[PDB]
Amino acid sequence: GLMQFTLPVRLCKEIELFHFDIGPFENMWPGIFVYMVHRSCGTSCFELEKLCRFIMSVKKNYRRVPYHNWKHAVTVAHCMYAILQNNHTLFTDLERKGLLIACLCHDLDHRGFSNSYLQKFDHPLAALYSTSTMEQHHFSQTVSILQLEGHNIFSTLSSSEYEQVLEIIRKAIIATDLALYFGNRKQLEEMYQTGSLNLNNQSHRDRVIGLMMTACDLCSVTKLWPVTKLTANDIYAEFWAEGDEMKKLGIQPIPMMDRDKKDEVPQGQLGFYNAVAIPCYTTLTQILPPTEPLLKACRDNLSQWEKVIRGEE
Numbered sequence: 001g002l003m004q005f006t007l008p009v010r011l012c013k014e015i016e017l018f019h020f021d022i023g024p025f026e027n028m029w030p031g032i033f034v035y036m037v038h039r040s041c042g043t044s045c046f047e048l049e050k051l052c053r054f055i056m057s058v059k060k061n062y063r064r065v066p067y068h069n070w071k072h073a074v075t076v077a078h079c080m081y082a083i084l085q086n087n088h089t090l091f092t093d094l095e096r097k098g099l100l101i102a103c104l105c106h107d108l109d110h111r112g113f114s115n116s117y118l119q120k121f122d123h124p125l126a127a128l129y130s131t132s133t134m135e136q137h138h139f140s141q142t143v144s145i146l147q148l149e150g151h152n153i154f155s156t157l158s159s160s161e162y163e164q165v166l167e168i169i170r171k172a173i174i175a176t177d178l179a180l181y182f183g184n185r186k187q188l189e190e191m192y193q194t195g196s197l198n199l200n201n202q203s204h205r206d207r208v209i210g211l212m213m214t215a216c217d218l219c220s221v222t223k224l225w226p227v228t229k230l231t232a233n234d235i236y237a238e239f240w241a242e243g244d245e246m247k248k249l250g251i252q253p254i255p256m257m258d259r260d261k262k263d264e265v266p267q268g269q270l271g272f273y274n275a276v277a278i279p280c281y282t283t284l285t286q287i288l289p290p291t292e293p294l295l296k297a298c299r300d301n302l303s304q305w306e307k308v309i310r311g312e313e
């Protein structure tokens, strides 16, 4: 119980910043996550025996794909940490517990293909789950691992506290479905502007946790430019594998997934920053002022992509 996780000095300082990169040493990532749980939640929130067993089973259930991998899990959870640490007083003990676990679990057993490719392939998961296919699957894998002997990190919570946290994790994981993000943010936009946004209203909290989940999930666009640029190669490697698979089903994929159309990537990233990322970090900064460093980093990276187009890189 008097066993604190610590980090080397550079990490101990940088981990507190939104643009922290967790590094290329896979074996440090579990202790990075536990470090974050201990400061966000307490040394008490979890039995360390069960937490570590849980962390290693989650690691095991992420596949070896270019982007939707164990590194993405820990990276999304570190963004959620930065958010929770800059908005201390706005979140319950249960939400702090649940959200770091939702982030680590949010892409469990991802194969690197979109909901669309699952529906066109006619994958069984697409008969089981007609919308948010992968995300209902990621939530299912999360419950599965929570139910393995010695893996129930929530065992100490009341029957009703247990139901509440599992409901936070489910809504948090479904929200990562980017097809749901647009309406969710448009609603937060109106609510904030017309003045009816209210964090005592649970349905409004749900929406705000959803937008945070989208923000953490897209956090590649909020890093230092060389991290953003190198992550985008991993992202596109999956996109082009999916477009190849489309071509194999006899469907011309969208250009963004066509490896014959790499020339259009910089313009495709502009759309993405303008249609998705900038609006996401804007509404987040309005609802949660301390998260502004994410909007600023996102704007800096749009300008780096504009520079790529203008052939200055």
Ligand SMILES: Cc1nc2ccc(N)cc2nc1C
Binding pocket: 178, 217, 218, 219, 220, 221, 232, 235, 272
């Ligand atoms: C950088 C980046 N680019 C994207 C382009 C398209 C898409 N659907 C999702 C994307 N997500 C990220 C994080």
Ligand SMILES: [Mg+2]
Binding pocket: 106, 107, 134, 176, 177
């Ligand atoms: Mg996902």
Ligand SMILES: [Zn+2]
Binding pocket: 072, 076, 106, 107, 176, 217
């Ligand atoms: Zn993700």
